[PDB]
Design an enzyme around this catalytic site. Structure first.
Site, PDB file in Angstrom:
ATOM      1  N   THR E  79       0.820  -1.206   0.000  1.00 60.38           N
ATOM      2  CA  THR E  79       0.000   0.000   0.000  1.00 60.38           C
ATOM      3  C   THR E  79       0.856   1.258   0.000  1.00 60.38           C
ATOM      4  O   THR E  79       0.481   2.262  -0.616  1.00 60.38           O
ATOM      5  CB  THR E  79      -0.929   0.002   1.214  1.00 60.38           C
ATOM      6  N   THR E  80       2.003   1.223   0.677  1.00 62.94           N
ATOM      7  CA  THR E  80       2.869   2.394   0.722  1.00 62.94           C
ATOM      8  C   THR E  80       3.516   2.659  -0.631  1.00 62.94           C
ATOM      9  O   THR E  80       3.645   3.818  -1.037  1.00 62.94           O
ATOM     10  CB  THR E  80       3.941   2.209   1.797  1.00 62.94           C
TER      11      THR E  80
END
Lengths: 435, 65, 510, 54, 477, 327
Positions: E79-80
């Site tokens: 997600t990052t």
């Protein structure tokens, strides 16, 4: 951000044309200039307006030279060149907002300037240079718009038969003039006592006529005419007229530095006829009562020679009062319809710049600025450049029938020096001071 | 709040000029329209002289005449 | 306040603010805009009307620009952004003429003089499509191009066939009277764009009263009531009064007579499907299993009237006034579920060419389904205008460049003060396609006037612009065609916007 | 270095913030350490050498 | 227009620069504290939890967080990298607009760059159809990288073994309903149990039997009415009943005469997961008797783990299910343990459907930059600059991981360019020693579908920002 | 430290942007006016005349003018090309310093880049072992490029026949002393600058492709060298190549063309073969330099490559300036 300088050179040049435009044409508005000494003046001649402006910005400094360049090439329409260049840059701001480069606009105006002279060629009427009757009508018509317009019919032919120096003194009148094949000076032969010499030889400092208290007496013993107090402007003309050369030393006085003349006497002017040397020269004797009359009399003939010079280079005539400008603004709009790239939008803006000349003359003539140019576009589309703006009567009339004519060189040079100067402004990215 | 004499008449003269200037361009069949907005935001576009003055509601007494 | 030369200079720039913002969202390569709704919701789209609908601006000059969209979307729809660009582009050139000294009235009339020259040129270069013969082959393919400027290009082919058939079913091509009220757009989350359906009738998101009911009713019997077949109750609460077992055993038999009367009354009248407003209890549904008659429950308020038009039913208030004439007519009613979702919408199909269809849109996202609602409604405007006039002109900037020269050539034939307005209306029409090239990331002017030589020097017919990043110009070969009624309205409604602003030179509000 | 983004300056604020808490209780170290004053907003004052109550 | 383009990029750059420090295994921590509450103080380094909790008023920056939630709900990992890679793409894009580049022209080259980038991930995608022993070795590297920079980084050797074991116990579809996760107190991070018969985290009844034979799983005035509802259950003929609410003792005792094991207080997953494991059915309504599918279970055993009774099943239809039993001291540790486990099972389940894998640790990202720069050999003029910016953005992904780990990012990352160009498409950054090494030798790799999804979501999330040019703010209500 | 670093980089960027406009055949004009002398107002576009008269006070910029003046005395042409390549290097190098990159490491990355950059010139340069008609015809391309952006655009091709044949008749070393007024002042100046470049081509017949072709080829080799170098040196090579790519980007913008497309397409052209493509300043497109007949001298491009790179190594290395009391 290089737009900071291109925007300033336009607004700096825009302010010069926005002011002097009101003095356009003979029926233009005067101005009130305040000089540094404190006194003021009231004059509409544009050459004196910008000469006293004392501009500082570089963009406006180029417009002062733009007017001076027209004064040497054509000599007429001095204010018309600054108004065109002022209106062109006014349209350029609309182009830079669209994201067009200045160099793209320069080469686009090269096409407008190329097609610009073509539009004037089809409408212009060629004439014969040798026909002095056409040289007199073409010269006397434009001379009516000068200051001394009443005595224009008699000053015009004095420039015809001479084609050149103009001698002027107080006393007499303007109507009397005489063409001198040799040379004439504004000086006297004092303190000599002869005042009439045949078989004369001239040498600028055997030599009987000297063109420069103990020297006044010794030079009279040998019966030598002593003429002194001569400025440098006459030294350049006497050398080509009679074939003399300067003598800067007593030992350098010899036979190779003298001249010849069949007659050199003071009829107080020094009428010296019979040059008898290879050359092409003439001097016109002008008379007048007041000093302000003879000064304007010189400008009357000197401006008349500018029209003769215009007919020699361009043996053609065109209608006045912005008549050929309507054809220039309309036909260029049609040529842009067939072009592509960024040249179409630039040729269109070049035509809108010329629409303001008849709109400004319509303003200075009291007519509506819009209804005057809008009615002439159809009159030229269906007709020709005969109809235009007549400032004498204040209305639309046939300019060819109203006896108003200007040569082809005046309108051509006004557009070449103007467009080339705008391209010089477009080629400026920024200005820096040195030391 | 009182004033009389010559300059008092000028206040009424120059005040009536503003009412005429508000409907100066509406005379004739091809006259310009005017936009008036009430508190509800309703904008009325029209060139009728009677409807313009009915919604302007000028507090000056000389204009009410 | 603002009178004379300084009056319109503030109004023109007030209108240019809406044009310069939306001139970049023109064409298929248009830059979208960020929406900040009043409730904090956020979306991004490229529709011209959706921008003007959300632009909460207080300037009155710009407020009238929104009123133009209410009448333009019903007629044009797709070119909502281009009309505002020409509206601001004309006011841009008008400011150049206001400084010259012309009154705004002569400019508003000069554009109406030039607008008729352009409409005259549109009829000339218009090419027929279905002249003297009706066919669905090019009608669907031209609709495939209408959806190409959106994100729905992945499954635009199946969506174009459903939209074309939806119009021909409820509306006739010969009569040329298409009704949008007969075509309703529904939508549910789940599926993809290619999972679109067409229900010849109407659909509501309500299930039956019991799972044991028939899931397929072939009979043309639909009973539309506001009071279901059960012991009567008000809209809020029945509130049966019971003190002890004495009343519980007497009131149970009173409802027993009601349970056997109203349930059997459905067969006495001949109805099969019972579309009732309020729901049924478990007791009422047990007898429907023996009667073999389905029924709908919890039918909303406006859902009742939507069925009476398509099926031809009537709203009955009570079971006493039931008869044969008040029954609705349908071909097949069914219940269609979606994977594991308990929507169970009431699928009513006429199984024939009825005057009411419903396009059920499916998709895995509600914002993409909402984007498909407008992309389909815009296609109806292209279908409706084609029905009224089979002739069409090639859009994508070819008409305006061809219309500009026809107007510029007619400007010389008018010795009148509106001549400058004819010259300015031509240069203003060139800005609509000049925005298409600027949003494509190319040189706008060099891409613009290159078409002028093509429509004049190369050939007389008009050629398109390489806007969709295709091979070259001449979009006729790429099948990008706009309506003839739209191009005449885009230039006409634009002049009406300028006609309303030039005649206003003073704003007054206490 | 130019170092437009300054996340290291944020670390010094985290050091000087924690540095002040240790320097305050630094002199109360050991049995022979100094005592500290604790005055309440209501005016209750007490002096003690307990490192945890400080 | 001039002010609007910067507000959308600068607003998006702040969100990317906010959580870029959490990238890599040695990522930095970040303090989270709401104003006005002392109990809400917390510190973490998970990029998905940082952006989900922090509010954003800028609308252009709001969608960057919204698209990240799709990566967290579906993939659960990387997600990052989505918000990060989408950020530096905008940093260079803002610099291109200064070079007289249109936002639409940049999307043209990016769509071509994603193909050269997606193909590079496909060419390096190493499938594993055979060698289940080596495929098991592959699942540990994807599980070990998911738990990097988490709370369980110290005990990664234990959780990676229980994670890959549950995958091999399944050996089929990627349905995570068969894998149950038990949260119980006691024990350290290494004290996690594991079971294969779908162990449950619920105790039941007062005196219930811990063993039964041939169980039929059917999932679903006080003394007179409860007895009536029990008669509704005995008609089905079962020996095990599950209910969603708690079951009272009085109707529970009537089951003792027939021997029906009464399971009480079943949650949402307790009813859905056993629908496929035990082969039963939901059957939320049990009024009509003998009209629902009855399950099948041979032995329902009970093993007490974590000082709480746990229900163990056996002999179930398609009994490839299992249970990863997590153990911690308190609930705050069980919260961090459950999220990192389920997020690991998501990408692991993706690997059973797609066994293809690429070399991670910055190896695959640099190969994407070379194939894109190789794509610059055959491209138009303007797109060559757009693909150049997309390449420098992918090159800066490990530049941030090297800075977060403290190593000189100008040397280790820029050395990979010369390593991957002339063959050797396996070299990556070794985070343990802080040097460059071959990923195939060290045994570090990630899923090909996870690297492809972040590559698509990052190219798509930035596609929406470039299409925006003017912001419109309506009246707040 | 920080006060003195920006005085060198920003002090040089202002001199780079000063002559950014006169680059290319369509270079812009420049206005100049000294203090106290109002009649000294003039207009020109020559880079050798712009910087020689402008007084410089920043000490970091004085060396850039002296080092570039060697191009004016020995080569006589391309002096503007030296300052542009230098400023573009220091502009990107200032961003590398923001990424924690030492200036000394960047110089080591440039010395490695100048090796591969010079290797591209030799591979592209075309010697003339025979075919003097083709050599003499190509000399007109050398003389045609030197007289670009001058007042002699009317008789540009006429003067190319004068300078080329003038050296064939001398038959000696490069000593050129043995062979209105403003029209003659510009004509004699460009005549001396055209003959000085001609003397090198007759000595060294090697000639490279012009019109931005030789500049992009030097960039492709350095970009390929980025994958054959250690880490920190690879970023210095990317910045050195980004400056060479921006060399024709300025000539395109000064010519009004879209520099984002025409210049950027030559990168893709020269990347995979096709080491002949160049910009067409007349038509505004991309074509074969060999077919169109556009080429420049190899000795001059190598000099600007070394001179601008050497002028940058001094300014980039220094970060502190010592100022004594004025006398």
């Amino acid at each position: 951000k290089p737009a900071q300088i291109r925007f300033s050179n336009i607004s700096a040049a825009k302010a010069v044309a926005d002011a002097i435009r009101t003095s356009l044409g003979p029926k233009g508005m005067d101005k009130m200039i305040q000089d540094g000494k404190g006194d003021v003046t009231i004059t509409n001649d544009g050459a004196t307006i910008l000469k006293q402006m004392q501009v500082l910005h570089p963009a406006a400094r180029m417009l002062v030279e733009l007017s001076k360049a027209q004064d040497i090439e054509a000599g007429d329409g001095t204010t018309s060149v600054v108004i065109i260049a002022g209106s062109l840059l006014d349209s350029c701001t609309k182009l830079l907002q669209k994201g067009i480069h200045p160099t793209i606009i320069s080469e686009s105006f090269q096409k407008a300037l190329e097609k610009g002279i073509e539009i004037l060629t089809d409408m212009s009427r060629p004439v014969e240079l040798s026909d002095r009757e056409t040289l007199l009508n073409s010269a006397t018509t434009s001379l009516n718009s000068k200051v001394v317009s009443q005595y224009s019919s008699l000053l015009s032919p004095m420039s015809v038969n001479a084609v050149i120096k103009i001698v002027k003194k107080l006393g007499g009148t303007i109507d009397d003039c005489e063409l001198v094949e040799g040379l004439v000076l504004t000086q006297k032969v004092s303190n000599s006592g002869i005042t009439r010499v045949e078989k004369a030889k001239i040498g600028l400092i055997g030599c009987n006529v000297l063109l420069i208290d103990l020297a006044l007496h010794f030079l009279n013993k040998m019966k030598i005419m002593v003429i002194k107090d001569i400025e440098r402007e006459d030294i350049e003309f006497i050398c080509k007229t009679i074939g003399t050369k300067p003598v800067a030393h007593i030992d350098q006085f010899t036979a190779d530095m003298l001249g010849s003349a069949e007659l050199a006497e003071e009829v107080k002017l020094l009428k010296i006829t019979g040059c008898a040397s290879p050359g092409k020269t003439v001097t016109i004797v002008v008379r007048g009562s007041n000093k302000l009359v003879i000064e304007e009399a010189e400008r009357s003939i000197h401006d008349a020679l500018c029209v003769i010079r215009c007919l020699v280079k361009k043996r053609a005539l065109i209608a006045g009062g912005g008549a050929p400008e309507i054809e220039l603004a309309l036909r260029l709009t049609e040529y842009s319809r067939t072009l592509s790239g960024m040249e179409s939008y630039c040729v269109r803006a070049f035509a809108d710049a010329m629409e303001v000349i008849p709109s400004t003359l319509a303003e200075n003539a009291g007519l509506n600025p819009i209804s005057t140019v809008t009615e002439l576009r159809n009159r030229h589309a269906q007709g020709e450049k005969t109809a235009g703006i007549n400032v004498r009567k204040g209305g639309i009339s046939n300019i060819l029938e109203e006896l108003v004519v200007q040569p082809l060189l005046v309108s051509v040079s006004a557009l070449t020096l103007a467009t080339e100067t705008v391209r010089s402004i477009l080629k400026i990215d920024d200005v820096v001071n040195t030391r | 709040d009182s004033s009389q004499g010559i300059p008092q008449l000028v206040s009424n003269i120059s005040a009536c000029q503003v009412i005429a200037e508000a409907v100066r361009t509406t005379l004739g069949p091809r006259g310009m329209d005017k936009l008036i907005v009430d508190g509800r935001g309703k904008a009325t576009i029209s060139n009728d002289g009677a409807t313009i003055l009915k919604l302007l509601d000028v507090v000056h007494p000389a204009a009410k005449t | 306040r603002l009178m004379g030369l300084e009056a319109l200079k503030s109004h023109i720039m007030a209108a240019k603010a809406v044009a310069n913002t939306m001139r970049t969202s023109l064409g298929p390569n248009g830059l979208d805009k960020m929406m900040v709704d009043k409730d904090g919701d956020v979306t991004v789209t490229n529709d011209g009307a959706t921008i003007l609908s959300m632009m909460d601006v207080d300037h009155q000059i710009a407020k009238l620009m929104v009123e133009l969209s209410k009448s333009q979307d019903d007629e044009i729809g797709d070119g909502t952004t281009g009309v505002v660009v020409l509206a601001g582009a004309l006011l841009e050139e008008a400011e150049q003429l206001l400084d010259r000294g012309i009154h705004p009235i002569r400019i508003a009339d000069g554009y109406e003089q030039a607008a008729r020259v352009a409409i005259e040129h549109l009829d000339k270069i218009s090419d027929s499509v279905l002249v003297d013969i009706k066919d669905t082959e090019p009608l669907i393919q031209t609709a495939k191009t209408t959806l190409g400027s959106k994100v729905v290009n992945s499954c635009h082919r199946q969506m174009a066939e459903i939209a074309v058939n939806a119009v021909l079913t409820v509306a006739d091509m010969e009569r040329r009277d298409v009704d949008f009220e007969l075509i309703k757009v529904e939508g549910k989350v789940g599926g993809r764009l290619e999972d679109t359906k067409l229900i010849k009738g109407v659909i509501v998101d309500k299930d039956f009263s019991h799972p044991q009911m028939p899931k397929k009713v072939e009979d043309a019997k639909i009973a539309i009531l506001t009071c279901p077949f059960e012991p009567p109750k008000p809209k809020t609460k029945h509130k049966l009064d019971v003190t002890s077992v004495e009343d519980y055993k007497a009131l149970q038999k009173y409802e027993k007579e009601k349970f056997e009367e109203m349930i059997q009354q459905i067969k006495e009248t001949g109805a099969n499907l019972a579309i009732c407003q309020w729901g049924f209890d478990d007791e009422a549904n047990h007898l429907l299993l023996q009667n073999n008659l389905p029924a709908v429950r919890w039918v909303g308020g406006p859902e009742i009237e939507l069925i009476a038009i398509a099926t031809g039913g009537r709203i009955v208030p009570r079971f006493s006034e039931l008869t044969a004439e008040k029954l609705g007519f349908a071909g097949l009613v069914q219940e269609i579920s979606f994977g594991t979702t308990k929507d169970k919408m009431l699928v009513i199909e006429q199984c024939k060419n009825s005057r009411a269809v419903t396009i059920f849109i499916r998709g895995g996202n509600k914002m993409i389904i909402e984007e498909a609602k407008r992309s389909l409604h815009d296609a109806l405007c292209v279908i409706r205008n084609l029905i009224r006039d089979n002739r069409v002109v090639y859009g994508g900037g070819a008409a305006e460049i061809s219309c500009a020269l026809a107007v510029s050539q007619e400007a010389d034939k008018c010795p009148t003060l509106e001549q400058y307005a004819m010259r300015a209306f031509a240069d203003a029409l060139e800005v609509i396609p000049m925005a298409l090239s600027e949003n494509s990331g190319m040189n706008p002017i060099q891409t613009m006037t290159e078409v002028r030589a093509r429509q004049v020097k190369e050939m007389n017919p008009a050629l398109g612009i390489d806007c969709l990043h295709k091979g070259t110009n001449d979009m006729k070969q790429q099948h990008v065609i706009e309506t003839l009624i739209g191009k005449k309205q885009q230039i006409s409604l634009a002049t009406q916007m300028v006609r309303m602003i030039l005649k206003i030179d003073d704003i007054r509000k206490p | 270095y130019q170092d437009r983004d300054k996340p290291a300056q944020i670390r010094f604020s985290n050091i000087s913030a924690a540095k002040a808490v240790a320097d305050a209780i630094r002199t109360s170290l050991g049995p022979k350490g100094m005592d500290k004053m604790i005055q309440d907003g209501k005016g209750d004052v007490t002096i003690t050498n307990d490192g945890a109550t400080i | 227009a001039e002010t609007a383009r910067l507000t959308s990029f600068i607003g998006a750059i702040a969100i990317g620069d906010l959580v870029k420090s959490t990238l890599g295994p040695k990522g930095m921590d970040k303090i989270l504290l709401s104003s006005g509450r002392d109990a809400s103080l917390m510190v973490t380094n998970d990029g998905a939890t940082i952006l989900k909790n922090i509010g954003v008023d800028n609308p252009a920056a709001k969608v960057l967080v919204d698209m990240s939630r799709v990566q967290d709900d579906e993939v659960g990992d990387g997600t990052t990298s989505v918000t990060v890679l989408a950020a530096e793409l905008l940093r260079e894009a803002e610099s291109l607009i200064a070079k007289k580049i249109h936002p639409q022209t940049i999307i043209a080259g990016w769509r071509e760059a994603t193909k050269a980038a997606r193909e590079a991930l496909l060419s390096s995608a190493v499938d594993h159809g055979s060698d289940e022993v080596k495929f098991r070795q592959d699942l540990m590297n994807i599980a070990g990288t998911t738990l990097s920079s988490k709370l369980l980084t110290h005990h990664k050797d234990h959780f990676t073994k229980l994670a890959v074991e549950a995958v091999l116990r399944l050996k089929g579809s990627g349905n995570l309903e068969a894998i149950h996760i038990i949260k119980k107190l006691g024990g350290s991070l290494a004290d996690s149990y594991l079971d294969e018969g779908f162990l449950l985290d619920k105790k039941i009844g007062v005196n219930q039997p811990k063993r039964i034979e041939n169980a039929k799983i059917l999932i679903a005035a006080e003394k007179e009415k409860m007895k009536e509802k029990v008669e509704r259950i005995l008609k089905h003929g079962i020996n095990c009943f599950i209910n969603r609410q708690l079951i009272y003792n009085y109707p529970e005792q009537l089951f003792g005469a027939a021997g029906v094991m009464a399971i009480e207080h079943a949650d949402f997953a307790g009813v859905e997961r056993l629908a496929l494991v035990t082969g039963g059915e939901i059957a939320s309504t049990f009024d009509h008797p003998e009209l629902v599918k009855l399950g099948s279970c041979k032995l329902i055993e009970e093993v007490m783990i974590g000082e709480d009774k746990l229900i163990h099943f056996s002999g179930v239809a398609l009994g490839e299910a299992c249970t990863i039993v997590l153990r911690g001291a308190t609930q705050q540790i069980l919260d961090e343990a459950e999220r990192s486990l389920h997020d690991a099972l998501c990408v692991l389940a993706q690997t059973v459907k797609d066994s293809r894998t690429v070399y991670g640790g910055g190896c695959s990202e640099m190969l994407m930059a070379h194939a894109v720069t190789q794509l610059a050999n055959r491209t138009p003029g303007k797109e060559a600059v757009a693909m150049e910016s997309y390449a420098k953005a992918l090159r800066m992904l490990p530049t941030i991981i090297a800075d977060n780990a403290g190593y000189d990012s100008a040397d280790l990352v820029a050395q990979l360019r010369a390593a991957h160009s002339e063959g050797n498409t396996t070299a990556g950054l070794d985070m343990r020693e802080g040097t460059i090494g071959d990923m195939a030798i060290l045994g570090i790799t990630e899923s090909f579908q996870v690297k492809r999804q972040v590559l698509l979501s990052a190219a798509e999330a930035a596609e929406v920002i470039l299409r925006v040019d003017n912001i419109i703010k309506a009246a707040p209500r």
